[PDB]
Short mmCIF file of C-alpha atoms and ligand atoms in Angstrom, two decimals:
data_model
loop_
_atom_site.label_atom_id
_atom_site.label_comp_id
_atom_site.label_asym_id
_atom_site.label_seq_id
_atom_site.Cartn_x
_atom_site.Cartn_y
_atom_site.Cartn_z
CA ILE A 1 -120.80 -12.89 128.54
CA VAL A 2 -118.08 -12.31 125.93
CA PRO A 3 -118.10 -8.74 124.58
CA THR A 4 -118.01 -7.78 120.91
CA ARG A 5 -114.42 -7.59 119.62
CA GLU A 6 -113.15 -4.27 118.19
CA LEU A 7 -116.20 -2.44 119.46
CA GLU A 8 -115.08 1.00 118.22
CA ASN A 9 -114.26 -0.32 114.75
CA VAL A 10 -117.61 -2.22 114.46
CA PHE A 11 -119.58 0.83 115.74
CA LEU A 12 -117.80 3.17 113.35
CA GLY A 13 -118.05 0.72 110.39
CA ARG A 14 -121.80 0.20 110.88
CA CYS A 15 -122.22 3.90 111.38
CA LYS A 16 -120.48 4.74 108.07
CA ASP A 17 -122.23 1.97 106.15
CA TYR A 18 -125.58 3.23 107.43
CA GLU A 19 -124.78 6.91 106.77
CA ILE A 20 -123.84 6.47 103.13
CA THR A 21 -125.90 3.46 102.05
CA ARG A 22 -128.71 2.28 104.39
CA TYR A 23 -132.38 3.35 104.51
CA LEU A 24 -131.68 6.30 102.24
CA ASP A 25 -135.25 6.64 101.04
CA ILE A 26 -136.77 5.54 104.30
CA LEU A 27 -135.08 7.44 107.18
CA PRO A 28 -133.20 10.71 107.36
CA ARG A 29 -129.51 11.15 107.96
CA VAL A 30 -128.31 12.34 111.36
CA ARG A 31 -126.31 15.59 111.74
CA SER A 32 -123.58 14.18 114.01
CA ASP A 33 -120.56 12.56 112.41
CA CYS A 34 -119.83 8.95 113.35
CA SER A 35 -116.84 9.97 115.47
CA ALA A 36 -119.07 12.34 117.49
CA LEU A 37 -121.63 9.60 118.00
CA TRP A 38 -118.90 7.26 119.19
CA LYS A 39 -117.77 9.80 121.77
CA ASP A 40 -121.29 10.19 123.16
CA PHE A 41 -121.83 6.45 123.20
CA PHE A 42 -118.51 5.63 124.86
CA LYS A 43 -118.90 8.28 127.61
CA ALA A 44 -122.14 6.70 128.76
CA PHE A 45 -120.56 3.52 130.16
CA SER A 46 -116.80 3.91 130.14
CA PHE A 47 -114.64 4.15 133.30
CA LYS A 48 -117.49 2.89 135.43
CA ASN A 49 -118.22 -0.51 136.90
CA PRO A 50 -120.09 -2.54 134.31
CA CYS A 51 -123.35 -2.27 136.25
CA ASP A 52 -123.00 1.42 136.98
CA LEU A 53 -125.73 2.61 134.60
CA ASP A 54 -129.24 3.98 134.65
CA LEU A 55 -131.87 5.18 132.20
CA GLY A 56 -130.15 8.53 131.88
CA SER A 57 -126.70 7.18 131.03
CA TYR A 58 -127.04 7.25 127.23
CA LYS A 59 -129.22 10.37 127.08
CA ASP A 60 -126.66 12.42 125.05
CA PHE A 61 -125.99 9.56 122.65
CA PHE A 62 -129.70 9.20 121.94
CA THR A 63 -130.13 12.88 121.54
CA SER A 64 -127.43 12.97 118.86
CA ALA A 65 -128.50 9.72 117.22
CA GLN A 66 -132.25 10.19 117.07
CA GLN A 67 -133.82 10.48 113.60
CA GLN A 68 -137.23 11.92 112.66
CA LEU A 69 -139.40 8.87 112.02
CA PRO A 70 -141.79 8.45 109.07
CA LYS A 71 -145.39 9.13 109.96
CA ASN A 72 -147.67 6.06 110.33
CA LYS A 73 -144.83 3.60 109.84
CA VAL A 74 -143.45 3.11 113.34
CA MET A 75 -143.72 -0.44 114.67
CA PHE A 76 -143.24 -1.78 118.21
CA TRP A 77 -143.26 -5.43 119.24
CA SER A 78 -143.26 -7.69 122.32
CA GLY A 79 -142.29 -11.37 122.25
CA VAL A 80 -142.32 -11.73 118.45
CA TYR A 81 -139.02 -10.32 117.32
CA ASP A 82 -138.55 -12.39 114.20
CA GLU A 83 -142.11 -12.11 112.91
CA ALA A 84 -142.31 -8.41 113.60
CA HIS A 85 -139.06 -7.74 111.76
CA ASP A 86 -139.94 -9.99 108.93
CA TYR A 87 -143.30 -8.25 108.47
CA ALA A 88 -141.78 -4.77 108.73
CA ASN A 89 -139.53 -5.85 105.90
CA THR A 90 -136.38 -3.81 106.58
CA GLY A 91 -138.16 -0.51 106.56
CA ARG A 92 -140.28 -1.05 103.52
CA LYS A 93 -143.58 -1.63 105.27
CA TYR A 94 -142.76 -0.49 108.77
CA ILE A 95 -139.80 0.94 110.71
CA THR A 96 -138.46 -0.95 113.75
CA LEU A 97 -135.89 0.34 116.18
CA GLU A 98 -133.29 -1.91 114.54
CA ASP A 99 -133.69 0.01 111.25
CA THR A 100 -132.85 3.32 112.95
CA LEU A 101 -129.26 4.47 113.24
CA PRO A 102 -128.59 3.65 116.94
CA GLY A 103 -130.57 0.45 116.59
CA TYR A 104 -128.61 -0.67 113.53
CA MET A 105 -125.28 0.30 115.08
CA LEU A 106 -125.69 -1.62 118.37
CA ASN A 107 -127.95 -4.50 117.21
CA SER A 108 -126.70 -7.75 118.80
CA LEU A 109 -123.52 -6.22 120.23
CA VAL A 110 -122.27 -6.79 123.80
CA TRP A 111 -120.16 -4.22 125.67
CA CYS A 112 -119.49 -3.03 129.20
CA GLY A 113 -117.52 -0.50 131.14
CA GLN A 114 -114.72 -1.00 133.60
CA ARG A 115 -112.90 1.47 135.85
CA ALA A 116 -109.34 0.78 134.70
CA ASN A 117 -107.86 1.73 131.35
CA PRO A 118 -109.01 1.48 128.69
CA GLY A 119 -112.38 2.11 130.37
CA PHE A 120 -114.27 -0.84 128.87
CA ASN A 121 -113.83 -4.56 129.26
CA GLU A 122 -112.63 -6.34 126.16
CA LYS A 123 -112.52 -9.73 127.84
CA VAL A 124 -115.64 -10.28 129.79
CA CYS A 125 -118.96 -8.66 130.78
CA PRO A 126 -121.30 -9.54 133.65
CA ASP A 127 -124.28 -11.69 132.82
CA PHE A 128 -127.21 -9.26 132.38
CA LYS A 129 -129.12 -10.50 135.36
CA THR A 130 -126.34 -9.65 137.77
CA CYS A 131 -126.94 -5.88 137.39
CA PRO A 132 -129.97 -3.85 138.62
CA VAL A 133 -132.90 -3.53 136.22
CA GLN A 134 -132.18 0.15 135.47
CA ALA A 135 -128.60 -0.77 134.49
CA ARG A 136 -129.67 -3.84 132.46
CA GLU A 137 -132.20 -1.75 130.60
CA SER A 138 -130.17 1.50 130.36
CA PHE A 139 -129.27 1.28 126.68
CA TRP A 140 -132.19 -0.41 124.98
CA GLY A 141 -134.67 1.18 127.39
CA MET A 142 -133.47 4.70 126.55
CA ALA A 143 -133.31 3.63 122.89
CA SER A 144 -136.96 2.51 123.05
CA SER A 145 -138.03 5.69 124.91
CA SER A 146 -136.35 8.02 122.46
CA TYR A 147 -137.82 6.08 119.50
CA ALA A 148 -141.34 6.09 120.99
CA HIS A 149 -141.14 9.84 121.69
CA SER A 150 -140.33 10.32 117.99
CA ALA A 151 -143.29 8.35 116.65
CA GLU A 152 -146.03 10.23 114.70
CA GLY A 153 -149.37 9.15 113.21
CA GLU A 154 -150.53 5.58 113.53
CA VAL A 155 -148.22 3.21 115.38
CA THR A 156 -148.38 -0.55 115.16
CA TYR A 157 -147.67 -2.99 117.94
CA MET A 158 -147.22 -6.69 117.26
CA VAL A 159 -147.69 -9.06 120.23
CA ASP A 160 -147.59 -12.83 120.93
CA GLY A 161 -151.11 -14.12 121.43
CA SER A 162 -150.10 -17.76 121.90
CA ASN A 163 -147.78 -17.69 124.91
CA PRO A 164 -149.49 -19.35 127.90
CA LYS A 165 -146.70 -18.01 130.14
CA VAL A 166 -146.45 -14.28 129.23
CA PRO A 167 -149.41 -11.96 128.62
CA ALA A 168 -149.62 -10.41 125.20
CA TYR A 169 -149.40 -7.00 126.85
CA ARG A 170 -147.52 -6.50 130.16
CA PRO A 171 -146.97 -3.24 132.03
CA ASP A 172 -143.42 -4.25 132.73
CA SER A 173 -142.35 -5.17 129.19
CA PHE A 174 -140.23 -2.71 127.23
CA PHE A 175 -143.33 -1.57 125.41
CA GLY A 176 -145.25 -1.14 128.66
CA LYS A 177 -142.39 0.69 130.40
CA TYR A 178 -140.71 2.63 127.59
CA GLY A 179 -143.06 2.52 124.60
CA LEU A 180 -146.67 3.34 125.45
CA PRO A 181 -145.85 5.87 128.21
CA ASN A 182 -143.67 7.79 125.78
CA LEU A 183 -146.07 8.12 122.86
CA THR A 184 -146.81 11.84 122.38
CA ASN A 185 -149.93 13.54 121.17
CA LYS A 186 -148.45 13.34 117.64
CA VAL A 187 -149.59 9.72 117.74
CA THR A 188 -153.21 9.21 116.60
CA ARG A 189 -153.88 5.46 116.86
CA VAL A 190 -152.28 2.28 118.19
CA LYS A 191 -152.93 -0.64 115.86
CA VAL A 192 -152.32 -4.00 117.54
CA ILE A 193 -151.51 -7.14 115.60
CA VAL A 194 -151.92 -10.34 117.59
CA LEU A 195 -149.65 -13.13 116.27
CA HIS A 196 -150.98 -16.64 116.70
CA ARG A 197 -148.10 -19.02 115.80
CA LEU A 198 -149.27 -21.87 113.59
CA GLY A 199 -149.92 -25.12 115.41
CA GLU A 200 -150.07 -23.43 118.83
CA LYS A 201 -153.10 -23.00 121.10
CA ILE A 202 -154.53 -19.48 120.98
CA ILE A 203 -154.11 -17.80 124.37
CA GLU A 204 -155.00 -14.13 123.98
CA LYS A 205 -157.59 -12.44 121.77
CA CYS A 206 -158.47 -8.91 120.91
CA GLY A 207 -160.90 -7.36 123.37
CA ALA A 208 -160.06 -9.70 126.24
CA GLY A 209 -157.42 -10.21 128.98
CA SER A 210 -154.29 -8.08 128.71
CA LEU A 211 -155.39 -6.84 125.29
CA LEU A 212 -158.50 -5.32 126.85
CA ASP A 213 -156.28 -3.68 129.48
CA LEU A 214 -154.20 -2.30 126.66
CA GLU A 215 -157.26 -1.08 124.74
CA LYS A 216 -158.44 0.84 127.81
CA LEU A 217 -155.00 2.39 128.43
CA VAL A 218 -154.69 3.44 124.80
CA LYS A 219 -158.16 5.04 124.81
CA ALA A 220 -157.40 6.80 128.11
CA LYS A 221 -154.43 8.43 126.37
CA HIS A 222 -156.93 9.63 123.72
CA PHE A 223 -155.47 7.51 120.95
CA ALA A 224 -157.69 5.55 118.62
CA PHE A 225 -157.28 1.78 118.89
CA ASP A 226 -157.73 -1.26 116.70
CA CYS A 227 -156.70 -4.86 117.03
CA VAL A 228 -156.52 -7.80 114.58
CA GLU A 229 -155.39 -11.39 115.00
CA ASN A 230 -153.30 -12.98 112.21
CA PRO A 231 -154.40 -10.57 109.55
CA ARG A 232 -153.96 -12.12 106.08
CA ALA A 233 -150.64 -10.49 105.21
CA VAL A 234 -149.14 -11.73 108.47
CA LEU A 235 -150.74 -15.19 108.14
CA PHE A 236 -149.11 -15.49 104.72
CA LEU A 237 -145.68 -14.72 106.19
CA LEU A 238 -146.16 -17.46 108.82
CA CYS A 239 -147.35 -19.85 106.11
CA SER A 240 -144.25 -19.25 104.06
CA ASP A 241 -142.28 -21.02 106.82
CA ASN A 242 -144.88 -23.78 107.43
CA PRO A 243 -146.81 -24.13 104.18
CA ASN A 244 -148.42 -27.47 105.15
CA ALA A 245 -149.96 -26.07 108.28
CA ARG A 246 -153.73 -26.54 108.37
CA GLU A 247 -154.25 -22.75 108.47
CA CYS A 248 -152.40 -22.38 105.16
CA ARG A 249 -154.64 -24.49 102.92
CA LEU A 250 -155.12 -22.82 99.54
CA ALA A 251 -158.46 -22.74 97.71
CA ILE B 1 -124.03 7.22 87.04
CA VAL B 2 -123.21 8.75 90.40
CA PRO B 3 -120.37 7.03 92.26
CA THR B 4 -120.73 5.98 95.89
CA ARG B 5 -119.37 8.62 98.26
CA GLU B 6 -116.44 7.71 100.54
CA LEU B 7 -115.95 4.41 98.73
CA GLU B 8 -112.99 3.35 100.87
CA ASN B 9 -114.75 4.19 104.19
CA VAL B 10 -117.88 2.27 103.15
CA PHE B 11 -115.90 -0.78 101.87
CA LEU B 12 -113.80 -0.91 105.07
CA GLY B 13 -116.80 -0.28 107.35
CA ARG B 14 -118.84 -3.03 105.69
CA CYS B 15 -115.80 -5.31 105.70
CA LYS B 16 -115.20 -4.85 109.44
CA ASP B 17 -118.88 -5.12 110.33
CA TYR B 18 -119.04 -8.31 108.28
CA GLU B 19 -115.81 -9.77 109.75
CA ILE B 20 -116.86 -9.39 113.38
CA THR B 21 -120.60 -9.70 113.32
CA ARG B 22 -122.27 -10.97 110.13
CA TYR B 23 -123.11 -14.53 109.02
CA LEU B 24 -121.04 -15.97 111.86
CA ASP B 25 -122.83 -19.27 111.96
CA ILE B 26 -123.45 -19.46 108.18
CA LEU B 27 -120.18 -18.49 106.43
CA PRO B 28 -116.48 -18.70 107.39
CA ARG B 29 -114.27 -15.65 108.03
CA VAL B 30 -111.54 -15.14 105.42
CA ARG B 31 -107.82 -14.95 106.30
CA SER B 32 -107.16 -11.53 104.74
CA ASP B 33 -107.66 -8.38 106.77
CA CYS B 34 -109.88 -5.58 105.49
CA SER B 35 -107.00 -3.32 104.53
CA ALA B 36 -105.47 -6.15 102.40
CA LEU B 37 -108.83 -6.72 100.74
CA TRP B 38 -109.15 -3.03 100.00
CA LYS B 39 -105.69 -3.02 98.41
CA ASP B 40 -106.69 -5.91 96.14
CA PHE B 41 -110.05 -4.35 95.26
CA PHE B 42 -108.69 -0.87 94.52
CA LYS B 43 -105.82 -2.03 92.32
CA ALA B 44 -108.21 -3.90 90.05
CA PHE B 45 -109.56 -0.59 88.66
CA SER B 46 -107.47 2.28 89.99
CA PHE B 47 -105.37 4.59 87.80
CA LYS B 48 -106.96 3.33 84.59
CA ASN B 49 -109.65 4.51 82.25
CA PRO B 50 -113.03 3.52 83.66
CA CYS B 51 -113.57 0.90 80.90
CA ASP B 52 -110.08 -0.58 81.15
CA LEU B 53 -111.22 -3.80 82.88
CA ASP B 54 -111.58 -7.45 82.00
CA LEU B 55 -112.45 -10.66 83.74
CA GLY B 56 -108.99 -10.91 85.30
CA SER B 57 -109.01 -7.43 86.83
CA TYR B 58 -110.38 -8.44 90.26
CA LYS B 59 -108.75 -11.87 90.32
CA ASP B 60 -106.63 -11.14 93.41
CA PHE B 61 -109.54 -9.56 95.28
CA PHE B 62 -111.90 -12.46 94.67
CA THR B 63 -109.24 -15.05 95.46
CA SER B 64 -108.60 -13.30 98.77
CA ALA B 65 -112.30 -12.81 99.52
CA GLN B 66 -113.65 -16.24 98.64
CA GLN B 67 -115.35 -18.25 101.35
CA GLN B 68 -116.14 -21.94 101.54
CA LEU B 69 -119.92 -22.08 100.94
CA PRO B 70 -122.51 -24.19 102.84
CA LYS B 71 -123.40 -27.42 101.06
CA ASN B 72 -126.92 -27.50 99.52
CA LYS B 73 -127.58 -23.87 100.40
CA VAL B 74 -126.17 -21.90 97.51
CA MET B 75 -128.72 -19.86 95.57
CA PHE B 76 -128.30 -17.97 92.26
CA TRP B 77 -130.91 -15.61 90.84
CA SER B 78 -131.60 -13.67 87.68
CA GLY B 79 -134.12 -10.80 87.37
CA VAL B 80 -135.74 -11.34 90.82
CA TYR B 81 -133.62 -9.51 93.45
CA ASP B 82 -136.27 -8.82 96.05
CA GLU B 83 -138.06 -12.17 95.85
CA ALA B 84 -134.82 -14.20 95.84
CA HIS B 85 -133.42 -12.36 98.88
CA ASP B 86 -136.65 -12.42 100.77
CA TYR B 87 -136.91 -16.18 100.22
CA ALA B 88 -133.25 -16.85 100.99
CA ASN B 89 -133.81 -14.87 104.24
CA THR B 90 -130.30 -13.55 104.94
CA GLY B 91 -128.61 -16.86 104.80
CA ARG B 92 -131.12 -18.72 106.93
CA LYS B 93 -132.71 -20.70 104.10
CA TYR B 94 -130.16 -20.05 101.33
CA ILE B 95 -127.01 -18.01 100.76
CA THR B 96 -126.98 -15.48 97.87
CA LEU B 97 -123.90 -13.87 96.41
CA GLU B 98 -124.96 -10.74 98.28
CA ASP B 99 -124.51 -12.51 101.64
CA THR B 100 -120.90 -13.48 100.86
CA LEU B 101 -118.14 -11.12 101.97
CA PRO B 102 -117.36 -9.60 98.56
CA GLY B 103 -121.00 -9.44 97.49
CA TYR B 104 -121.97 -7.85 100.83
CA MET B 105 -119.20 -5.27 100.64
CA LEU B 106 -119.96 -4.04 97.12
CA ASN B 107 -123.72 -4.62 96.87
CA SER B 108 -125.40 -1.51 95.36
CA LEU B 109 -122.16 0.46 95.20
CA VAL B 110 -120.91 2.35 92.19
CA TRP B 111 -117.26 3.06 91.42
CA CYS B 112 -114.79 3.41 88.59
CA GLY B 113 -111.19 4.17 87.76
CA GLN B 114 -109.57 7.23 86.21
CA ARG B 115 -105.91 7.67 85.25
CA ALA B 116 -105.40 10.93 87.12
CA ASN B 117 -104.85 11.04 90.85
CA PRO B 118 -106.52 9.81 93.06
CA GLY B 119 -107.01 6.94 90.59
CA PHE B 120 -110.79 6.75 90.84
CA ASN B 121 -113.62 8.98 89.80
CA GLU B 122 -115.64 10.64 92.55
CA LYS B 123 -117.91 12.60 90.24
CA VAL B 124 -119.20 10.37 87.46
CA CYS B 125 -118.97 6.77 86.24
CA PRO B 126 -120.03 5.38 82.79
CA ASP B 127 -123.52 3.83 82.41
CA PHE B 128 -121.26 0.89 81.62
CA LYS B 129 -123.70 -0.15 79.00
CA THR B 130 -120.98 2.16 77.63
CA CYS B 131 -117.99 -0.14 78.37
CA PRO B 132 -117.13 -3.30 76.43
CA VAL B 133 -118.78 -6.45 77.79
CA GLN B 134 -115.66 -7.82 79.52
CA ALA B 135 -115.30 -4.48 81.38
CA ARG B 136 -118.97 -4.05 82.33
CA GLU B 137 -119.01 -7.62 83.63
CA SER B 138 -115.48 -7.56 85.21
CA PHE B 139 -116.60 -7.29 88.83
CA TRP B 140 -119.93 -9.13 89.12
CA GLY B 141 -118.91 -11.72 86.48
CA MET B 142 -115.82 -12.71 88.42
CA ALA B 143 -117.94 -12.54 91.60
CA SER B 144 -120.36 -15.03 90.04
CA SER B 145 -117.61 -17.25 88.67
CA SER B 146 -115.84 -17.52 91.97
CA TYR B 147 -119.08 -18.12 93.93
CA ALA B 148 -120.21 -20.81 91.44
CA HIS B 149 -116.81 -22.51 91.65
CA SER B 150 -117.23 -22.80 95.44
CA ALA B 151 -120.78 -24.19 95.36
CA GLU B 152 -121.37 -27.75 96.57
CA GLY B 153 -124.32 -30.15 96.63
CA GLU B 154 -127.75 -28.95 95.49
CA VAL B 155 -127.80 -25.41 94.07
CA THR B 156 -130.99 -23.39 93.62
CA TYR B 157 -131.66 -20.91 90.85
CA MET B 158 -134.57 -18.46 90.99
CA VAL B 159 -135.71 -16.88 87.72
CA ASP B 160 -138.48 -14.53 86.44
CA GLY B 161 -141.14 -16.50 84.58
CA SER B 162 -143.23 -13.39 83.92
CA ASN B 163 -140.98 -11.06 81.90
CA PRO B 164 -142.08 -10.77 78.25
CA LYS B 165 -138.77 -9.02 77.36
CA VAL B 166 -136.21 -11.23 79.07
CA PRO B 167 -136.25 -15.00 79.03
CA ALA B 168 -136.20 -16.79 82.37
CA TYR B 169 -132.89 -18.35 81.44
CA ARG B 170 -130.41 -16.98 78.98
CA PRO B 171 -126.80 -17.77 78.22
CA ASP B 172 -125.76 -14.16 78.47
CA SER B 173 -127.03 -13.46 81.98
CA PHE B 174 -124.52 -13.46 84.81
CA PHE B 175 -125.74 -16.92 85.73
CA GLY B 176 -125.76 -18.22 82.12
CA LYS B 177 -122.30 -16.84 81.36
CA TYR B 178 -120.52 -17.10 84.69
CA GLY B 179 -122.59 -19.29 86.96
CA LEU B 180 -123.65 -22.53 85.25
CA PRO B 181 -120.44 -22.98 83.27
CA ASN B 182 -118.45 -22.75 86.49
CA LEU B 183 -120.39 -25.23 88.62
CA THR B 184 -118.04 -28.11 89.43
CA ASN B 185 -118.45 -31.82 90.00
CA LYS B 186 -119.13 -31.03 93.70
CA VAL B 187 -122.60 -29.85 92.55
CA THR B 188 -125.19 -32.62 92.40
CA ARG B 189 -128.43 -30.95 91.31
CA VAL B 190 -129.72 -27.63 89.99
CA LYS B 191 -133.14 -26.81 91.44
CA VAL B 192 -134.94 -24.07 89.52
CA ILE B 193 -137.64 -21.90 91.05
CA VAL B 194 -139.71 -19.99 88.51
CA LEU B 195 -141.39 -16.84 89.84
CA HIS B 196 -144.86 -16.18 88.35
CA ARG B 197 -145.48 -12.67 89.57
CA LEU B 198 -148.94 -12.29 90.97
CA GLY B 199 -151.51 -10.79 88.62
CA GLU B 200 -149.13 -10.98 85.64
CA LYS B 201 -149.15 -13.08 82.52
CA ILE B 202 -147.07 -16.29 82.67
CA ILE B 203 -144.36 -16.06 80.04
CA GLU B 204 -142.19 -19.10 80.89
CA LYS B 205 -142.88 -22.51 82.45
CA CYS B 206 -140.82 -25.45 83.61
CA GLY B 207 -140.21 -27.95 80.81
CA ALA B 208 -140.62 -25.41 77.99
CA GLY B 209 -138.84 -22.48 76.35
CA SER B 210 -135.64 -21.27 77.96
CA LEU B 211 -136.26 -23.52 80.97
CA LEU B 212 -136.05 -26.56 78.74
CA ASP B 213 -132.83 -25.17 77.27
CA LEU B 214 -131.51 -24.86 80.82
CA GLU B 215 -132.64 -28.40 81.70
CA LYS B 216 -130.72 -29.77 78.71
CA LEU B 217 -127.57 -27.93 79.74
CA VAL B 218 -127.80 -29.01 83.39
CA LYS B 219 -128.30 -32.68 82.44
CA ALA B 220 -125.38 -32.48 79.99
CA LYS B 221 -123.16 -31.56 82.94
CA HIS B 222 -124.41 -34.74 84.70
CA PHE B 223 -126.28 -32.80 87.36
CA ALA B 224 -129.79 -33.73 88.42
CA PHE B 225 -132.46 -31.20 87.61
CA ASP B 226 -135.76 -30.06 88.98
CA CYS B 227 -137.99 -27.08 88.44
CA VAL B 228 -141.04 -25.69 90.24
CA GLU B 229 -143.24 -22.63 89.59
CA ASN B 230 -144.29 -20.59 92.62
CA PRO B 231 -143.62 -23.27 95.20
CA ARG B 232 -145.83 -22.57 98.17
CA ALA B 233 -143.05 -21.19 100.38
CA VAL B 234 -142.38 -18.54 97.76
CA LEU B 235 -146.07 -18.01 96.83
CA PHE B 236 -146.93 -17.18 100.44
CA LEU B 237 -144.19 -14.55 100.57
CA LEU B 238 -145.62 -12.98 97.36
CA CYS B 239 -149.07 -13.13 98.91
CA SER B 240 -147.95 -11.40 102.08
CA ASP B 241 -147.23 -8.34 99.92
CA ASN B 242 -150.43 -8.63 97.84
CA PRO B 243 -152.90 -10.54 99.99
CA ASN B 244 -155.93 -9.87 97.78
CA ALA B 245 -154.34 -11.35 94.68
CA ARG B 246 -156.45 -14.15 93.15
CA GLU B 247 -153.56 -16.60 93.49
CA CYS B 248 -153.67 -16.19 97.28
CA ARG B 249 -157.24 -17.33 97.85
CA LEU B 250 -157.41 -19.62 100.90
CA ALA B 251 -159.68 -22.67 101.31
O1 N1C C 301 -135.95 -7.00 128.47
C1 N1C C 301 -135.27 -6.64 127.24
C2 N1C C 301 -135.98 -6.19 126.05
N1 N1C C 301 -137.28 -6.38 125.70
C3 N1C C 301 -137.40 -5.93 124.42
N2 N1C C 301 -136.20 -5.48 124.00
C4 N1C C 301 -135.29 -5.70 124.96
N3 N1C C 301 -133.97 -5.45 125.04
C5 N1C C 301 -133.29 -5.70 126.14
N4 N1C C 301 -133.89 -6.18 127.25
C6 N1C C 301 -133.09 -6.50 128.44
O2 N1C C 301 -131.84 -5.90 128.69
C7 N1C C 301 -130.94 -6.98 128.77
C8 N1C C 301 -130.09 -6.61 127.63
O3 N1C C 301 -130.56 -6.81 126.31
P1 N1C C 301 -129.62 -7.11 125.02
O4 N1C C 301 -129.13 -8.54 125.07
O5 N1C C 301 -128.52 -6.11 124.77
O6 N1C C 301 -130.78 -6.90 123.89
P2 N1C C 301 -131.30 -8.03 122.86
O7 N1C C 301 -130.33 -8.12 121.68
O8 N1C C 301 -131.73 -9.28 123.60
O9 N1C C 301 -132.65 -7.22 122.42
C9 N1C C 301 -132.50 -5.88 121.91
C10 N1C C 301 -133.92 -5.41 121.64
O10 N1C C 301 -135.10 -6.11 122.10
C11 N1C C 301 -135.87 -5.00 122.67
C12 N1C C 301 -134.93 -3.80 122.63
O11 N1C C 301 -135.60 -2.54 122.53
C13 N1C C 301 -134.44 -4.25 121.32
O12 N1C C 301 -134.94 -3.74 120.18
C14 N1C C 301 -131.52 -8.25 128.20
O13 N1C C 301 -131.09 -9.34 128.98
C15 N1C C 301 -132.97 -7.98 128.28
O14 N1C C 301 -133.52 -8.48 129.50
#
């Protein structure tokens, strides 16, 4: 895979942009300066083989980069990236990891270490499946763990309820591995939103299948639980992109 | 008004982020590097009184920063920032000026010149309703002119049809003054979208009032014209944010 060009410059540019201008009324500023964050980030992977990573590698980076998250507004998602982000609305209705500083800085970027100077590969990175799971997941898994550990109040989790191939909730998804296990007792409720894409056969429903497994796990952690399928506000978002869908017929 | 802190760092950080990572499959990269663009931007206003600007001040900057724009995808808007950008969807449905390099770099920012070193004011800028019209409109007017000049094919214009104080279309808006008059013969059609805010009185409608004045002007330029009020794609986005509104009732 081809890595992001001028990694340090893009990291530092996003970092400065975010610091001064992004999410000002939504998320707090971090204490560390961008240059300090860059040092922590770079030390996690640099001068190592590109697969030489584990869930602890970026611990210091996430420590420095982690913001306090607004109560009741934290959102998680599995399988529905675009809908979840669209609904969250860039921080206005919910927060996603991509609205947080480390999320915003590294969103969509590709990088990897190497042993020789300059300690990272500017030409080429291994396909992600060639490394061990703990290396593949080192960055975004720690990102997701640190974010989950910071959540307070009600959290929302949006899942795909129309994928015949992947359960709406899986123990081995990022939410199952790094999200739910890391929710602290500051969390009070998990609110699940089941997305049924328009025109697709409904596969999973609240109170059944993997969603019932999830309900039981959430209750066992002493969180309250609720679950809704295509609630109106979400249905309207889907309809905006497919207004002639049967489900979108206006009175 | 309070000027943006670290103006140069934010401009350069946004410029570099944009260059390497933003709109890659939507808009072309420009030839000029970010330091060259900064030089052109800064010289437009630096070492002058804060109102000592006119439409030519940022000529070099905008000439350097201008991108070829995607045919049929250019959108203009007046009075409807959030709705226009939500609908345009970060370049996926339409481009807005704020998705172009210069619009992205300076969106939301506040700056102004002073004669004394360092040539710009870090403490306070004029409300600019204080500067003469050519100065107040120097930056965003030239931005609009240059963007309109580059537009090709069908262009879309979203307006507020629910504002009792400000007509949907007026000749002195940025679009009326700098947009429409600068559309070239590469433009084939102006498609107007009139926002009727949910729960609010309708003030303007297609085929009447200022929208009829606009229709006349568009036809006089030998462009085709159409106009729709709350087309369903836009209505459903409004509804997502106010799902109990009467307009949103489903069959
Ligand atoms: O399994 C996921 C995953 N599920 C959910 N997420 C994942 N990120 C990475 N991974 C894996 O690590 C490797 C690397 O991901 P990436 O390309 O950098 O993230 P990407 O750009 O595909 O996705 C980044 C992203 O999507 C969330 C993550 O927390 C975050 O917000 C991928 O191939 C994925 O398999």
